[PDB]
Coordinates of C-alpha atoms and ligand atoms in Angstrom, one line a residue:
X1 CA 0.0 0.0 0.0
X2 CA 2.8 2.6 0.5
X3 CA 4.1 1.5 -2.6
X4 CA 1.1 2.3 -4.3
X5 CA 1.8 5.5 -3.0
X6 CA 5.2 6.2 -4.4
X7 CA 3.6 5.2 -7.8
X8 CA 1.1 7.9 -7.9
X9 CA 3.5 10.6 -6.3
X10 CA 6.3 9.8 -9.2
X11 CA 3.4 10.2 -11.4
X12 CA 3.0 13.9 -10.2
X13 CA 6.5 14.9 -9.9
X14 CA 6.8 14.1 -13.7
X15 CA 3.3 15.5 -14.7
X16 CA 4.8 18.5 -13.1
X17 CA 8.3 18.6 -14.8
X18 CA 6.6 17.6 -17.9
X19 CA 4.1 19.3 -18.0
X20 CA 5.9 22.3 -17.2
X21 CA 8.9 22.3 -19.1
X22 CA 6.7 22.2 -22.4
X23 CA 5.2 25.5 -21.5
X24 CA 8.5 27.4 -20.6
X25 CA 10.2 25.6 -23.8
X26 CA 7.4 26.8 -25.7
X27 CA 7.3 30.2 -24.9
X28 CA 11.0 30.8 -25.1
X29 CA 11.0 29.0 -28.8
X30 CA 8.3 30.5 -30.5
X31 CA 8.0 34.1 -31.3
X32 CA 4.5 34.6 -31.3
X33 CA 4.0 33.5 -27.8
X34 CA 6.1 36.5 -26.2
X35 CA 3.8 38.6 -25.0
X36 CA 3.5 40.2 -22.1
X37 CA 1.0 37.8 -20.3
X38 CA 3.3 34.5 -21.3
X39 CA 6.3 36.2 -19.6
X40 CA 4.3 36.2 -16.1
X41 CA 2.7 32.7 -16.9
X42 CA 6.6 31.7 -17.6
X43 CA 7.5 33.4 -14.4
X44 CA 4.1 30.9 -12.7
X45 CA 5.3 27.9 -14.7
X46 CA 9.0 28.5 -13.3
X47 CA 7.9 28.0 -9.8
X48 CA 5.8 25.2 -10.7
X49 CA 9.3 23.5 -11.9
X50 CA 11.4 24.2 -9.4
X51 CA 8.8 22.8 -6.9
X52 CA 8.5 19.7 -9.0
X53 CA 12.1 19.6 -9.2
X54 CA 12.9 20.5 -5.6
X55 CA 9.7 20.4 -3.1
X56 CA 7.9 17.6 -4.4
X57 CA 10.3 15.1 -4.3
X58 CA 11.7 15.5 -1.5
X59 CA 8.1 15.8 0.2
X60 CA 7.7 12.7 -1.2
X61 CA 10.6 11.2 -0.2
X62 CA 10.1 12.7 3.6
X63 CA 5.9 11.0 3.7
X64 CA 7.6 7.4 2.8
X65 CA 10.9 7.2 4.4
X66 CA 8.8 8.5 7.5
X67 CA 11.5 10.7 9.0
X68 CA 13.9 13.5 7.6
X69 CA 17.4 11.9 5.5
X70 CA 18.5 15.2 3.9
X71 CA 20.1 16.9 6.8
X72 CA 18.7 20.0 8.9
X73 CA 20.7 22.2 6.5
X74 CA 18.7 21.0 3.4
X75 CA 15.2 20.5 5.6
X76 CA 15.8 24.2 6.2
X77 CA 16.2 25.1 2.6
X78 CA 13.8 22.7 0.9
X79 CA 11.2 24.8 3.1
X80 CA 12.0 28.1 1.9
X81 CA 12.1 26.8 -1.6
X82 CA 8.8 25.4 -0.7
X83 CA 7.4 28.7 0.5
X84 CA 9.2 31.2 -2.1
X85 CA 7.0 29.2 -5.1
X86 CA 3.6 29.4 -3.0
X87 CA 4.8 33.2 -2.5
X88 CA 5.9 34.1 -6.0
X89 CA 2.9 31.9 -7.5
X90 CA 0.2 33.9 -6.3
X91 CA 1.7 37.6 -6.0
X92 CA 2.3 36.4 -10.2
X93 CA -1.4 35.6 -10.5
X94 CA -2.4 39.1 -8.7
X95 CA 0.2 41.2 -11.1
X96 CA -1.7 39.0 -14.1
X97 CA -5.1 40.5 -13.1
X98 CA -3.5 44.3 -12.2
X99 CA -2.2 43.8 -15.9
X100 CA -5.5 42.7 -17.0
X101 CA -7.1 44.9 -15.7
X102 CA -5.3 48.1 -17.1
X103 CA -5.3 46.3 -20.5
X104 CA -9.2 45.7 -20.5
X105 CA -10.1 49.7 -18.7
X106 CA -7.0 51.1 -21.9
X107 CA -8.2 52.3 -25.5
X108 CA -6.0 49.0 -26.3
X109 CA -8.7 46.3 -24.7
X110 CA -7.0 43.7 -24.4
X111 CA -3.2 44.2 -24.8
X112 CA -0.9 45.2 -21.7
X113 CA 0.1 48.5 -20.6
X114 CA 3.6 47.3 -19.8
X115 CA 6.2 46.8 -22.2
X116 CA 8.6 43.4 -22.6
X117 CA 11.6 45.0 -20.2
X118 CA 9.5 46.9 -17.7
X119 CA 7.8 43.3 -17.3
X120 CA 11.0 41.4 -16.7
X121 CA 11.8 43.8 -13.8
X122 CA 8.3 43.3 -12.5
X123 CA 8.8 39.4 -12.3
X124 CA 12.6 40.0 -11.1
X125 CA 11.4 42.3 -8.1
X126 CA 8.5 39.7 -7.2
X127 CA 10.8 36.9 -6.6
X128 CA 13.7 39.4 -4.7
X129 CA 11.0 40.6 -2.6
X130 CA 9.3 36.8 -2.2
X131 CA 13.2 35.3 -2.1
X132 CA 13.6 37.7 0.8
X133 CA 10.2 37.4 3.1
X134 CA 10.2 33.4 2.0
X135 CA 14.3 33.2 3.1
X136 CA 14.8 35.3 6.2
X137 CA 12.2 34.2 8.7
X138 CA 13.4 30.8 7.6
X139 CA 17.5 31.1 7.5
X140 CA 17.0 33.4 10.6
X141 CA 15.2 30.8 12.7
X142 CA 12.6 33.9 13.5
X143 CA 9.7 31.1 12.4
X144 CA 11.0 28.8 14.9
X145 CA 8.6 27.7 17.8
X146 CA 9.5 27.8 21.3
X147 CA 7.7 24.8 23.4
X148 CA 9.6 22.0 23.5
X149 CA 8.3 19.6 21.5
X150 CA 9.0 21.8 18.6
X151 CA 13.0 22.4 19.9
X152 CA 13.5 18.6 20.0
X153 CA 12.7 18.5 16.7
X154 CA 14.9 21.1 15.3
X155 CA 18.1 19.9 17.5
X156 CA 17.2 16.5 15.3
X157 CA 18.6 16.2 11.7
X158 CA 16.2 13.4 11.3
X159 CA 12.9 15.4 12.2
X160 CA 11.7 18.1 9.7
X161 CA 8.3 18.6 10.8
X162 CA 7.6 22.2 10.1
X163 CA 6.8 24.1 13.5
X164 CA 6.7 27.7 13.7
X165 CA 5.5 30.4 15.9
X166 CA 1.9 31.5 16.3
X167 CA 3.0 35.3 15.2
X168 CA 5.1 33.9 12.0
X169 CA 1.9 31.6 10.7
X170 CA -0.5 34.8 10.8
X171 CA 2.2 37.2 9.2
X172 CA 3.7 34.8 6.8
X173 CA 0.1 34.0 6.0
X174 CA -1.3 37.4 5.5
X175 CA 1.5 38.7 3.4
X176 CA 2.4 35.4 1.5
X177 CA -1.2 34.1 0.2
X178 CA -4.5 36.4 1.9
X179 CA -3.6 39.9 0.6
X180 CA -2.8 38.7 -2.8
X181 CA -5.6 36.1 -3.1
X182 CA -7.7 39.4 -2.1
X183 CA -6.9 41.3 -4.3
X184 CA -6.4 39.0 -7.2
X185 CA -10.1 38.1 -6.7
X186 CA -11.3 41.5 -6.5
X187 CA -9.4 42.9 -9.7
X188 CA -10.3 39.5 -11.6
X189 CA -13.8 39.9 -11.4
X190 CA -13.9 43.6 -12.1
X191 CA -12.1 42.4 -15.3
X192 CA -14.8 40.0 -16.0
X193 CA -17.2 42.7 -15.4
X194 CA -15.2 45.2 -17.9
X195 CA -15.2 42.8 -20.7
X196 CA -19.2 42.3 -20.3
X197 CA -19.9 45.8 -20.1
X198 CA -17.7 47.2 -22.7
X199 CA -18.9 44.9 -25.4
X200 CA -19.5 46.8 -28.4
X201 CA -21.5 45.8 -31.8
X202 CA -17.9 45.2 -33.6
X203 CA -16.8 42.6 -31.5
X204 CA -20.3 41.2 -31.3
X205 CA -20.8 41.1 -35.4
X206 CA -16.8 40.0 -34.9
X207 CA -18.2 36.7 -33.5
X208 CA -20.8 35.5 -35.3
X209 CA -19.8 36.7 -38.4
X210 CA -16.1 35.1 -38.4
X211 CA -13.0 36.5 -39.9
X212 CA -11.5 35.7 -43.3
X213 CA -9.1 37.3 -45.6
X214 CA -8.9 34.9 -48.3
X215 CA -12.1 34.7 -50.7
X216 CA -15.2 32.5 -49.4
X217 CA -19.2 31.9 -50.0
X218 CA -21.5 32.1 -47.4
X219 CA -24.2 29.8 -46.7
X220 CA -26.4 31.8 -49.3
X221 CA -23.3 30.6 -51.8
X222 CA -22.4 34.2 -52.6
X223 CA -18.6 35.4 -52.7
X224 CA -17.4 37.4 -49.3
X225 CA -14.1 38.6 -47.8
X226 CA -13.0 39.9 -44.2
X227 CA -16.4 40.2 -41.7
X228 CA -19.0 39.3 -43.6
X229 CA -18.6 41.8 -46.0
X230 CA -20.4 40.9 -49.8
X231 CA -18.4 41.1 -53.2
X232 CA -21.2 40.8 -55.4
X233 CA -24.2 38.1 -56.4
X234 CA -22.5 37.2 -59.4
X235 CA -21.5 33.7 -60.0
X236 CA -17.7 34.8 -61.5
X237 CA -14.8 34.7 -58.8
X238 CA -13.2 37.5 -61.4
X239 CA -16.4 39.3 -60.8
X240 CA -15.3 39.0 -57.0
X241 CA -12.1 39.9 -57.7
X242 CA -12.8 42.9 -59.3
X243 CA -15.3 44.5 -57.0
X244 CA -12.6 44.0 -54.5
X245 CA -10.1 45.8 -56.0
X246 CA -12.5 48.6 -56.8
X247 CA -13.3 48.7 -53.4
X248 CA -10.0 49.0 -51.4
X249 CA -8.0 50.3 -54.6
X250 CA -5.0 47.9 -55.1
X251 CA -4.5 44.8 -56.6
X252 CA -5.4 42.4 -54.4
X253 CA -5.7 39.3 -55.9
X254 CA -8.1 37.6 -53.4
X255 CA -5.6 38.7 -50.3
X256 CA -5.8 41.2 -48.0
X257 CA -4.6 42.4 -44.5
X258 CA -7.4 42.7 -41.2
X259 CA -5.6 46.5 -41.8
X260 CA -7.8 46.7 -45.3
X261 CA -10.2 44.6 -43.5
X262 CA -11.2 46.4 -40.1
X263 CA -11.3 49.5 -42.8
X264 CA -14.3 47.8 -44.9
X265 CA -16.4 46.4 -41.2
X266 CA -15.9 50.0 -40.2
X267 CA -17.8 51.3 -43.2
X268 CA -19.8 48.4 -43.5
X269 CA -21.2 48.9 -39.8
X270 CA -21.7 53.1 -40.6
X271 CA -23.8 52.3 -43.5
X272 CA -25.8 49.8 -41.5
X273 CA -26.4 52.2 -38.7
X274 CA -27.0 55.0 -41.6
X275 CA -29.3 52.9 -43.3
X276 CA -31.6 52.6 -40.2
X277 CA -31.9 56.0 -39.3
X278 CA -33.0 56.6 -43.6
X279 CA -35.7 53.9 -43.1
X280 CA -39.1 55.1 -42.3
X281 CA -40.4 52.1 -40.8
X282 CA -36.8 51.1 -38.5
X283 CA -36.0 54.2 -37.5
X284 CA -38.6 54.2 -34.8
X285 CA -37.6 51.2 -33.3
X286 CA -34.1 52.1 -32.7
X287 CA -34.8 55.1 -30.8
X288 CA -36.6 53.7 -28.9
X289 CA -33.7 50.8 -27.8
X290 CA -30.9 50.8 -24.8
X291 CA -27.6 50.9 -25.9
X292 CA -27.5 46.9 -25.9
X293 CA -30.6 46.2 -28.2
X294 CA -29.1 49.0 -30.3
X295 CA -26.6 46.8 -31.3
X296 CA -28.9 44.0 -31.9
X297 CA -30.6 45.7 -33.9
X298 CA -27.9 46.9 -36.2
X299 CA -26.9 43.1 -36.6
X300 CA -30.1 41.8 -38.1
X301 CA -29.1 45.0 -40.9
X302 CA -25.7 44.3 -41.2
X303 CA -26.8 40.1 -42.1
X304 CA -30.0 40.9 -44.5
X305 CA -30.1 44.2 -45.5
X306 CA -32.7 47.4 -44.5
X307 CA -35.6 46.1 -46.4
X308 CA -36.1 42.5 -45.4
X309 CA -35.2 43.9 -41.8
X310 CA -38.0 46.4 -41.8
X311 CA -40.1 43.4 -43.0
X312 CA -40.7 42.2 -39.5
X313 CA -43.3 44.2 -38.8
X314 CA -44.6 42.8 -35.5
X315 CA -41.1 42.0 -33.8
X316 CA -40.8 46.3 -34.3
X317 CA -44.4 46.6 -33.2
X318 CA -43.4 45.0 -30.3
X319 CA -39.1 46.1 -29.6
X320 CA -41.1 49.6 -29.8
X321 CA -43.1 48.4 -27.3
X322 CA -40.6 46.8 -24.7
X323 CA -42.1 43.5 -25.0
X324 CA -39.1 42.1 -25.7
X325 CA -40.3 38.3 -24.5
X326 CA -43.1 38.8 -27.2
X327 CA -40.5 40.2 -29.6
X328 CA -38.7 37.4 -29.2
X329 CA -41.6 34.9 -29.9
X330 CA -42.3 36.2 -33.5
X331 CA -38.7 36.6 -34.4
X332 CA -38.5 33.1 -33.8
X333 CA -41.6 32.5 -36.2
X334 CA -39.4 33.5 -39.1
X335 CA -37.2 32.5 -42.0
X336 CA -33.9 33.6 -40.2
X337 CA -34.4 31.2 -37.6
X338 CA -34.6 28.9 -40.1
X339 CA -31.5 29.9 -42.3
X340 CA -29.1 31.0 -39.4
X341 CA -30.2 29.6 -36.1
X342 CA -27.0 29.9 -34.1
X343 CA -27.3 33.7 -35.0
X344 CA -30.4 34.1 -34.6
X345 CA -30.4 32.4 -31.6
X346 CA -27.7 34.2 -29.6
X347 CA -29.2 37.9 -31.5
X348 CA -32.8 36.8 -29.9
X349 CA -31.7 36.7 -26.3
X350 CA -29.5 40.0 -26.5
X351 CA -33.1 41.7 -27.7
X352 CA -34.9 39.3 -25.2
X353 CA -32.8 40.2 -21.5
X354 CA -31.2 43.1 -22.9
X355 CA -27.5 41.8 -21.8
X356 CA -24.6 40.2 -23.5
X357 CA -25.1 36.9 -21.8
X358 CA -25.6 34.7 -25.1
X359 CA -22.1 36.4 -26.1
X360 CA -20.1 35.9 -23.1
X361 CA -16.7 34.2 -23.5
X362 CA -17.2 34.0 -27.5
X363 CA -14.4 36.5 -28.8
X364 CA -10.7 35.3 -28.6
X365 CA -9.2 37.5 -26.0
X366 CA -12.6 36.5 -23.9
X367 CA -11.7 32.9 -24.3
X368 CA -8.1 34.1 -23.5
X369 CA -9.1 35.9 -20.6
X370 CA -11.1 32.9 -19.0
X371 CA -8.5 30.8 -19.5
X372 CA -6.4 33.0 -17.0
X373 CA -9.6 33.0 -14.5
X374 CA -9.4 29.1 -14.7
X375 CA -5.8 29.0 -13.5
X376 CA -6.2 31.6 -10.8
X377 CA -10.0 30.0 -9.7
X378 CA -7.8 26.8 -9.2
X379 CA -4.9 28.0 -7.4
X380 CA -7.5 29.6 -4.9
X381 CA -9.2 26.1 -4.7
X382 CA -6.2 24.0 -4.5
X383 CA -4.5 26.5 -2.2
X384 CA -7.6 27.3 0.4
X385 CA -8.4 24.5 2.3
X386 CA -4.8 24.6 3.7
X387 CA -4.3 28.1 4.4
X388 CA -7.4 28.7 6.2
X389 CA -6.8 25.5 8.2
X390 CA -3.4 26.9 8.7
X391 CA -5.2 29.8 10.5
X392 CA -7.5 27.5 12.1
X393 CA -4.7 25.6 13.9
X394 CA -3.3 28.7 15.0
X395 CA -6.6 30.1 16.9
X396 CA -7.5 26.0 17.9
X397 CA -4.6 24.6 18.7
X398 CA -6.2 20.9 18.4
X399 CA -8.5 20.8 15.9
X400 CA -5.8 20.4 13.6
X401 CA -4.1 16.6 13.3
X402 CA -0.4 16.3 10.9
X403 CA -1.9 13.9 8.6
X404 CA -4.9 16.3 7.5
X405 CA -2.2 19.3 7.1
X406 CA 0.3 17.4 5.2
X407 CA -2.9 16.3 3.0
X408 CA -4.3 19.3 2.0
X409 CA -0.6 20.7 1.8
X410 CA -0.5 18.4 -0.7
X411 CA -3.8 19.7 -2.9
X412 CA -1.5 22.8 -2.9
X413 CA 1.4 20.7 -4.4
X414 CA -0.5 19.1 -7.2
X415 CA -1.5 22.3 -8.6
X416 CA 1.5 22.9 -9.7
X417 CA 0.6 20.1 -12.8
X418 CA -2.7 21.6 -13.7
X419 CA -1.8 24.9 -15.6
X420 CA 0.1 23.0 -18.4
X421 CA -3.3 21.3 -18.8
X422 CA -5.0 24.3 -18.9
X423 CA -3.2 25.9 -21.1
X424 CA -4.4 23.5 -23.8
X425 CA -8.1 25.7 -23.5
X426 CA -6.0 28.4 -25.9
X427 CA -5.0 27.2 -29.6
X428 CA -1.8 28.8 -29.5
X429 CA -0.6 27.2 -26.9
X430 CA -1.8 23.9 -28.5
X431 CA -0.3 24.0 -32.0
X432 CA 2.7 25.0 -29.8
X433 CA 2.3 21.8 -27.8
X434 CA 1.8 19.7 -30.6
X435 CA 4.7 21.0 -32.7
X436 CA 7.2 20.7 -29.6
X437 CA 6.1 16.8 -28.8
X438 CA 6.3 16.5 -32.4
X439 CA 3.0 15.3 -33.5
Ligands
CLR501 C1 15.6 27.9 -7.1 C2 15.5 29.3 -6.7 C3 16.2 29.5 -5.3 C4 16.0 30.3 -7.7 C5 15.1 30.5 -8.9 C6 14.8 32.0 -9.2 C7 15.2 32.6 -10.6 C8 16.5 31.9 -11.0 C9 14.2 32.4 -11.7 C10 12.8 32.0 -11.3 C11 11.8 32.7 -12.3 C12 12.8 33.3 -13.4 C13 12.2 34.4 -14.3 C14 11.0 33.9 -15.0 C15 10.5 34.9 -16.0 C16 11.6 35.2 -17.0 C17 11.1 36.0 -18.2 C18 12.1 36.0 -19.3 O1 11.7 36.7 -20.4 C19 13.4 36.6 -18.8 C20 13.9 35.9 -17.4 C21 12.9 35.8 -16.4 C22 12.6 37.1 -15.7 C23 13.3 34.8 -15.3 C24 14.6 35.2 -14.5 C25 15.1 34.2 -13.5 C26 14.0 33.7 -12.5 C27 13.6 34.9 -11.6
CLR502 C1 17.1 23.7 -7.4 C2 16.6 23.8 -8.9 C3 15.1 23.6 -9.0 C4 17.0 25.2 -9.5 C5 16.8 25.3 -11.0 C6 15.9 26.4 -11.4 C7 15.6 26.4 -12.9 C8 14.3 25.6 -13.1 C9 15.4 27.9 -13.3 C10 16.7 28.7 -13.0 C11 16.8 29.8 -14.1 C12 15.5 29.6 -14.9 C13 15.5 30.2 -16.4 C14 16.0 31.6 -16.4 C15 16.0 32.1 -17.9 C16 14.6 31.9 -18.5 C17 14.6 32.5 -19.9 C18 13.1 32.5 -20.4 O1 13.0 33.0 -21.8 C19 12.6 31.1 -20.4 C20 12.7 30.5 -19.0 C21 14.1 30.5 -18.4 C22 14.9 29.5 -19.3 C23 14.1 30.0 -17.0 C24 13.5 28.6 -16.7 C25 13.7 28.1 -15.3 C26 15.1 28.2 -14.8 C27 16.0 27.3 -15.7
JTZ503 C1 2.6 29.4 7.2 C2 3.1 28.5 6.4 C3 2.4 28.1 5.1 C4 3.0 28.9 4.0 C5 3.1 30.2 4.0 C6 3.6 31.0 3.0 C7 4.1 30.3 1.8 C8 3.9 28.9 1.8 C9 3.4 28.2 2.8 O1 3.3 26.8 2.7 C10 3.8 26.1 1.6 C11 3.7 24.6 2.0 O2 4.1 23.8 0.8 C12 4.7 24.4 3.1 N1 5.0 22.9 3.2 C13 5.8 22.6 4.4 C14 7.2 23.3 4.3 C15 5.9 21.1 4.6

């Protein structure tokens, strides 16, 4: 049974090395990956190495054997090695959401405020400032307990039970994990909260029109290029080919850049909004609309055009009414449903509740930024259950028994295998994956 054990620890230790390893190589190989977000998450998936590599071993090692082998020199480093991860893991995970959260509240949604260098010195400082509050209390033996059980231990080379002062567990605590945790979890969801809020009708067309800049035909069969944007009706790809080059002014050839492309959705949305306010029978309508509905509105224009859009007749009778469940009822009876119901359906719902809840997570850097709540939500999760025990022990000094502290430690330590995992939620990170294990 305690070999069984050692089977699924070595497991873990290599999950974590492996798994690990393959996102550091990854970043430092490939070009596009640098970015000011994979620098921190390299800075995350360093400590999640060197505690593979160095606490989780010898943890292992310490369970099994039953006592301390390593010597009280090594007991006393392979616990501040152990503490400067957990310390430098989540003050990484609160920068990532203070960097998020500048990006998402800058003109640039999205992309940091920091540039490559300043970050490096940001990720430097952390672990000199961890390196230091992780080291000294440790090296200077100002952690160290002072009833006597706890002394007989430390005089031992064999015993490396970790015992430490009631004072050092509260300030260690606070500092290392509660203030950061805080913090992390009160930016984070403000950045969820930003994204929501500052949707716009350009990333919403964005998503459920797609992005292409070579030629295509939409489901109709007609030609298109970049978001959703028509070439003509004509059966002739020349015919395409010709309206493009007319339209941008070069000689395209089919290709084009999302520069020439962002150019046309621009126009292409202004003429949509234009073409509303010209209607008789729309114009109405959108007055009467919230910014939200506005946008759903425009939508519906921007896929079938200002006539067939004014067709619906009793979905406007009602939108202009506010009845937006019985909008929604009649926009159902209709064609569109029919032709485009993924569209239709998420378009519905933002007319129906008002909100962007049927868009939520479905633009890339929204998938990008979840992806980053999953790895902090887990850390939280993994981490938790021990720390608050931790502060548990130190206001009941007996509810507390070593084999449920060394067990939920441990929850802590196989976190440090997840991220990798993770990681595979984002596409560049996969193709990255794949390429590097050579598939
Ligand atoms: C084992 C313990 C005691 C020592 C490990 C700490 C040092 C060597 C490691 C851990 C994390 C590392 C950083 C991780 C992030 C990268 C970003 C990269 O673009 C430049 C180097 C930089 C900034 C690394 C510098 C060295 C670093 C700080
Ligand atoms: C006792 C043991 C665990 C100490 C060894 C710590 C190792 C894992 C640390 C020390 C220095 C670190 C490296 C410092 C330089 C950076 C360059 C960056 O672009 C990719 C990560 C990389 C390459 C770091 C990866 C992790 C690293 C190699
Ligand atoms: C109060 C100690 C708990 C703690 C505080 C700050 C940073 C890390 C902390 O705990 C990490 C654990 O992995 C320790 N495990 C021990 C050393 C066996």
């Amino acid at each position: 049974w305690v070999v069984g054990m050692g089977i699924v620890m070595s497991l873990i230790v290599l999950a974590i090395v492996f798994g690990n390893v393959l996102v550091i190589t990854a970043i430092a190989k490939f070009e596009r990956l640098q970015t000011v977000t994979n620098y921190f998450i390299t800075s995350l998936a360093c400590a999640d190495l060197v505690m593979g590599l160095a606490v989780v071993p010898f943890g292992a090692a310490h369970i099994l054997m039953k006592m301390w082998t390593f010597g009280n020199f090594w007991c006393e480093f392979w616990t501040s090695i152990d503490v400067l991860c957990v310390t430098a893991s989540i003050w990484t995970l609160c920068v990532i959401a203070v960097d998020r959260y500048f990006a998402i509240t800058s003109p640039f949604k999205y992309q940091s405020l920091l540039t490559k260098n300043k970050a490096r010195v940001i990720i430097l400082m952390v672990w000199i400032v961890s390196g230091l509050t992780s080291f000294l209390p440790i090296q200077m033996h100002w952690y160290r307990a002072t009833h006597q059980e706890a002394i007989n231990c430390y005089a031992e080379e064999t015993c490396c039970d970790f015992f430490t002062n009631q004072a050092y567990a509260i300030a260690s605590s606070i500092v290392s994990f509660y203030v950061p945790l805080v913090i992390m979890v009160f930016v984070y969801s403000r950045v969820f909260q930003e994204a929501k809020r500052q949707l716009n009708i350009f990333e919403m067309l964005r998503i459920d029109e797609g992005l292409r800049l070579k030629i295509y035909k939409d489901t109709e069969g007609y030609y298109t290029i970049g978001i959703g944007h028509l070439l003509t009706k004509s059966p002739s790809l020349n015919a395409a080919k010709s309206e493009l080059d007319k339209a941008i002014g070069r000689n395209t050839n089919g290709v084009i850049t999302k520069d020439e492309a962002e150019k046309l959705f621009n126009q292409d949305v202004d003429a949509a909004v234009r073409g509303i306010l010209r209607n008789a029978k729309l114009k109405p309508v959108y007055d009467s609309l919230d910014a939200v509905r506005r946008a759903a509105l425009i939508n519906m224009v921007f896929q079938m055009g200002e006539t067939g859009v004014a067709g619906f007749t009793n979905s406007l009778r009602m939108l202009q009414q506010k009845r937006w469940d019985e909008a929604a009822v009649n926009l159902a009876k209709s064609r569109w449903y029919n032709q485009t119901p993924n569209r239709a359906k998420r378009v519905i719902t933002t007319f129906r509740t008002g909100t962007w809840d049927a868009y939520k997570f479905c633009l890339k850097e929204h998938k990008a930024l979840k992806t980053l709540g999953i790895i902090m939500g887990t850390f939280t999760l993994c981490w938790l259950p021990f720390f608050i025990v931790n502060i548990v022990h130190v206001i009941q000094d007996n509810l507390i028994r070593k084999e449920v502290y060394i067990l939920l430690n441990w929850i802590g330590y196989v976190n440090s295998g997840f991220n990798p995992l993770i990681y595979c939620r984002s596409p560049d990170f996969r193709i990255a994956f794949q390429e590097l294990l050579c598939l």
